[PDB]
Design a protein around this ligand. Structure first.
Ligand SMILES: CCCCCCCC/C=C\CCCCCCCC(=O)OC[C@H](COP(=O)(O)OCC[N+](C)(C)C)OC(=O)CCCCCCC/C=C\CCCCCCCC
Ligand SMILES: CCCCCCCC/C=C\CCCCCCCC(=O)OC[C@H](COP(=O)(O)OCC[N+](C)(C)C)OC(=O)CCCCCCC/C=C\CCCCCCCC
Ligand SMILES: CCCCCCCC/C=C\CCCCCCCC(=O)OC[C@H](COP(=O)(O)OCC[N+](C)(C)C)OC(=O)CCCCCCC/C=C\CCCCCCCC
Ligand SMILES: CCCCCCCC/C=C\CCCCCCCC(=O)OC[C@H](COP(=O)(O)OCC[N+](C)(C)C)OC(=O)CCCCCCC/C=C\CCCCCCCC
Ligand SMILES: CCCCCCCC/C=C\CCCCCCCC(=O)OC[C@H](COP(=O)(O)OCC[N+](C)(C)C)OC(=O)CCCCCCC/C=C\CCCCCCCC
Ligand SMILES: CCCCCCCC/C=C\CCCCCCCC(=O)OC[C@H](COP(=O)(O)OCC[N+](C)(C)C)OC(=O)CCCCCCC/C=C\CCCCCCCC
Ligand SMILES: CCCCCCCC/C=C\CCCCCCCC(=O)OC[C@H](COP(=O)(O)OCC[N+](C)(C)C)OC(=O)CCCCCCC/C=C\CCCCCCCC
Ligand SMILES: CCCCCCCC/C=C\CCCCCCCC(=O)OC[C@H](COP(=O)(O)OCC[N+](C)(C)C)OC(=O)CCCCCCC/C=C\CCCCCCCC
Ligand SMILES: CCCCCCCC/C=C\CCCCCCCC(=O)OC[C@H](COP(=O)(O)OCC[N+](C)(C)C)OC(=O)CCCCCCC/C=C\CCCCCCCC
Ligand SMILES: Nc1ncnc2c1ncn2[C@@H]1O[C@H](COP(=O)(O)OP(=O)(O)OP(=O)(O)O)[C@@H](O)[C@H]1O
Ligand SMILES: Nc1ncnc2c1ncn2[C@@H]1O[C@H](COP(=O)(O)OP(=O)(O)OP(=O)(O)O)[C@@H](O)[C@H]1O
Ligand SMILES: [Ca+2]
Ligand SMILES: [Zn+2]
Ligand SMILES: [Zn+2]
Lengths: 455, 165
């Protein structure tokens, strides 16, 4: 038995009693301070019983709950998605076991000082890696083939190049990049705790495979050929969230873009068939022969298709740009004019612009989705889903409702308490919530209801 | 109109850095495999062709300067290959890949960002104007609360909740 636990229980009893006594309410207010400690370690939630009645539960916060990370909290709060009924409770509750496993990993990790310290500088390791990769690629670009502190680093690199040489500078930079990427991967695993789910889950994790590929590329740059260092420049997309969104603008409707490209290819095949059938003599292409200056590019259907696809798409005016220039007196001049105008209109003006139109549409779609998600998150309760306008002209404000009454993290703390507490010691509401969790029922989370609003 | 471009200038610059990285990769490939094809015509002030891929730096400069500025891409300036050559399919794939990846997509991301910014500015301006016109500055009540009331919204904002008062 610990006096602190008994004091906390008596404090919870006093808090419950103070609802009907103003003197107790005043005395329990904190001015080291026992009241302040109990107040920072006490939490409260609202639950709905079988009889659709709302009850306020006050419980002490489990000790393991102090190890939850602000990055994990922000990530959950910003990624949790609504369900068909428009409720985030399903996903937020589904992540509870992962949250508890993360708390236990953090508690285990903080006992290992070196590894915790290494895990605390993941951003530093990544920045160092990116800077080394940029410098290596710049040196390669500017010297290949051969034979803030950033200004200081550039000066040291110039001095190393001037004294030792480009090869030795590149070798030192590569070794440093490899050591730093290894430290970064060790820090990444120690922090994210991805092994906690399992070796299968860790392998399935895309970030971990991306880092492993980074490591392999760095090894290849160091040993096989320095030119493999260029691939590391792709880390810019990983590092930048705006560039990633810009690329998403294109990768969200990639199926649409590819179908448009297949449609362009089909129109090119048809135009090549027509040209082979009727304009064979007009496909004369000039050629710079290495040590005649023109060749026929439509003697076979395959080659004609290749010529059209390669040149008409890449020419502003279309296929007609590369074709032999016809004389007005020729009997096929109107046919050629119709051919050229039809290709330029159908393929260049319309089909080639469908890809850019799809990209623009995707841009707008991403903008609208992001705005809607931000609006919902900012102006709606995470748990109950009530809007800010329901709390206007109310004793309790929306901010207090989300800070004290329906705190999702307080609900998580209750779930962890129900998980850690022995079955024999459960109270009424603890047992009800445990039974509901066992039965896979979320009706105990409030929904569009608030005790402060109704009373 | 200039704000339409300067609001997401970071996005434009990141797109340009991405274009530069693709140009660096394409230049590396060309130097490794298409060195002989980088022949550029030159008007010498008082031979008429020069090799523009003898070093990686110069090749990068050539690609960045000409392939971005040419509608058809880098393939426009490269030596024209004969179908009988054993590298003709490689050259075709090179040219189509550069024109598709760099010109069609990457160069259009800047214009797409500009258009998106245009729309964002339009929507923000409309929302701000609507709020200002149809909401009380002080109390924030809308016009629809004053319908069928002795005191109208205009009188509420002119006499009752005057910010200048
Ligand atoms: C010229 C053409 C041939 C050479 C360049 C071609 C290929 C080599 C690879 C270039 C990779 C550039 C992308 C990475 C980069 O730009 O990362 C610069 C990092 C800073 O990274 P950060 O963590 O502060 O991220 C801050 C935001 N971020 C990363 C977006 C800037 O290092 C720095 O500042 C170092 C600045 C290095 C300055 C050398 C100039 C050329 C190379 C890179 C700078 C960008 C292009 C400049 C304009 C060229 C026009 C032709
Ligand atoms: C660009 C990619 C990196 C290429 C790279 O480092 O080349 C390494 C070597 C270069 O020397 P070399 O052996 O040709 O000549 C021998 C030595 N010297 C060049 C002095 C004559 O080339 C070779 O090994 C040539 C044979 C293999 C080349 C392809 C290597 C595999 C490709 C990897 C990256 C692919 C993905 C690109 C990113 C987009 C994906 C979505
Ligand atoms: C440096 C290159 C190293 C070698 C790469 C090839 C090795 C093979 C890797 C397989 C996986 C490739 C796909 C990426 C899977 C990882 C993933 O799923 O991450 C996607 C991320 C963006 O992640 P995010 O913005 O959602 O979070 C970012 C959170 N922050 C901002 C705090 C860092 O983008 C990315 O890695 C984009 C990376 C694009 C690489 C192209 C290679 C050609
Ligand atoms: C054209 C674009 C311009 C330049 C090429 C840049 C090369 C790097 C491309 C990075 C793409 C990327 O980072 O992915 C973007 C989206 C994001 O998806 P998310 O945020 O919903 O999921 C996040 C988890 N994540 C990533 C595993 C799905 O990914 C997806 O949806 C599917 C992405 C499929 C690849 C489309 C990008 C264009 C290049 C394709 C050839 C392969 C590139 C090498 C990297 C392939 C793996 C990414
Ligand atoms: C936009 C949509 C895309 C394409 C449609 C473009 C239609 C352009 C029509 C070209 C007509 C053309 O270029 O013709 C001009 C020639 C030049 O005459 P000249 O004085 O040099 O020769 C002496 C001949 N003399 C005495 C008759 C003058 O004279 C002639 O019309 C010669 C007689 C030609 C008669 C057949 C015309 C077939 C043209 C179009 C029908 C298909 C339209 C498809 C719409 C979709
Ligand atoms: C049109 C034939 C297509 C020609 C070439 C391919 C497409 C050309 C441009 C798009 C034309 C198009 O999709 O048309 C559709 C119109 C629809 O009209 P609506 O009011 O009944 O739709 C009521 C509402 N809804 C459509 C949802 C039912 O069909 C009509 O009725 C239009 C009937 C016109 C008949 C003479 C066509 C002569 C050829 C013109 C081609 C010039 C194209 C120039 C620009 C691009 C060139 C590279
Ligand atoms: C490409 C655009 C086309 C032609 C070039 C025109 C040259 C003049 C550019 C004037 C830019 C300007 O007037 O700024 C636009 C925005 C407005 O911003 P705001 O209305 O929220 O703040 C207002 C207070 N204000 C301005 C101190 C931030 O500014 C910002 O946000 C940051 C502006 C940074 C400069 C981006 C404009 C493109 C040129 C850059 C090179 C330097 C140009 C010389 C003038 C630089 C200082 C402006
Ligand atoms: C859109 C996305 C961007 C780029 C992908 C473009 C792919 C274009 C393919 C070009 C193929 C080409 O130009 O070939 C045509 C040549 C010409 O034949 P000829 O009668 O003048 O010579 C006699 C040879 N005889 C008897 C076999 C005919 O014949 C041949 O195919 C000769 C045999 C070539 C075999 C290797 C083909 C490699 C091509 C593509 C694979 C990579 C696709 C990447 C997709 C992303
Ligand atoms: C794709 C590989 C990239 C090739 C070149 C770079 C990018 C080409 C154009 C964009 C392609 C793209 O980002 O694709 C993404 C698609 C996504 O599809 P989803 O329905 O699963 O997305 C479901 C929803 N989400 C994506 C949010 C998870 O990935 C797929 O599944 C597509 C799988 C297709 C695999 C064969 C690819 C052959 C190469 C095609 C390149 C032709 C480009 C022509 C236009 C530009 C040329 C300059
Ligand atoms: N149900 C909810 N609806 C909306 N926002 C919520 C909800 N629960 C928590 N938040 C927000 O999530 C963030 C986490 O709140 P939290 O209780 O952790 O406060 P804190 O300021 O980080 O902690 P402390 O001040 O007690 O050290 C805060 O922005 C809080 O407003
Ligand atoms: N709280 C408010 N909400 C909305 N509009 C307001 C508010 N207070 C003032 N305004 C508007 O701001 C402008 C300034 O009003 P102001 O009292 O100065 O009237 P004025 O016509 O300029 O003066 P006067 O007629 O007395 O010489 C007017 O358009 C008024 O409608
Ligand atoms: Ca009991
Ligand atoms: Zn609530
Ligand atoms: Zn008012």
């Amino acid at each position: 038995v610990s006096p602190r636990e008994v004091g906390h229980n008596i404090y919870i009893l006093a808090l419950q009693l103070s609802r009907h006594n103003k003197q107790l309410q005043h005395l329990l207010k904190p001015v080291e301070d026992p009241l302040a400690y109990y107040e920072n370690h006490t939490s409260q939630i609202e639950i709905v019983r079988q009889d659709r009645s709302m009850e306020q539960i006050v419980f002490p916060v489990p000790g393991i709950c102090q190890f939850l990370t602000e990055e994990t909290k922000h990530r959950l709060f910003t990624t949790t998605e609504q369900d068909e009924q428009g409720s985030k409770v399903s996903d937020f509750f589904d992540q509870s076991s992962f949250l508890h496993n993360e708390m236990e990993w953090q508690r285990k990790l903080r006992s290992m000082p070196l590894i915790y310290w290494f895990s605390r500088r993941m951003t530093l390791w990544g920045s160092i890696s990116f800077n080394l990769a940029v410098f290596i690629n710049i040196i390669i670009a500017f010297f290949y083939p051969y034979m803030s502190i950033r200004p200081l680093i550039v000066a040291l690199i110039l001095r190393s190049i001037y004294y030792l040489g480009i090869g030795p500078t590149l070798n030192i930079l590569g070794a440093l990049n490899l050591t730093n990427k290894i430290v970064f991967v060790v820090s990444f695993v120690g922090n994210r705790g991805t092994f906690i789910r399992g070796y299968k889950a860790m392998v399935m994790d895309m970030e971990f495979l991306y880092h492993v590929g980074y490591i392999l590329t760095s090894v290849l740059g160091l040993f096989a050929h320095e030119l493999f260092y260029s691939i590391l420049l792709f880390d810019l997309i990983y590092r930048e969230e705006t560039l990633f969104n810009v690329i998403k603008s294109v990768t969200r409707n990639g199926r649409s873009i590819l179908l448009t490209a297949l449609l362009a290819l089909i129109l090119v095949y048809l135009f090549s068939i027509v040209g082979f059938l009727f304009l064979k003599d007009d496909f004369i292409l000039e050629v710079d022969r290495l040590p005649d200056s023109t060749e026929r590019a439509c003697d076979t259907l395959l080659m004609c298709i290749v010529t059209v696809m390669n040149h008409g798409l890449r020419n502003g005016g279309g296929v007609g740009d590369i074709l032999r220039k016809p004389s007005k007196d020729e009997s096929l001049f109107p046919a050629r004019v119709v051919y050229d105008l039809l290709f330029f209109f159908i393929v260049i003006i319309i089909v080639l612009n469908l890809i850019f139109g799809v990209i623009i549409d995707t841009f707008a779609d991403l903008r609208s989705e992001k705005q809607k998600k931000e609006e919902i998150l900012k102006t709606t309760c995470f748990i109950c889903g009530l809007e800010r306008d329901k709390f206007d002209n109310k004793t309790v404000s929306f901010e207090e409702h989300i800070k004290l009454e329906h705190n999702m993290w307080n609900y998580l703390y209750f779930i962890v308490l129900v998980r850690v507490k022995n079955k024999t010691d459960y109270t009424g509401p603890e047992s009800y919530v445990a039974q509901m969790i066992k039965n896979k029922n979320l009706d105990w989370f409030p929904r569009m209801r608030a005790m402060s609003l109704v009373s």
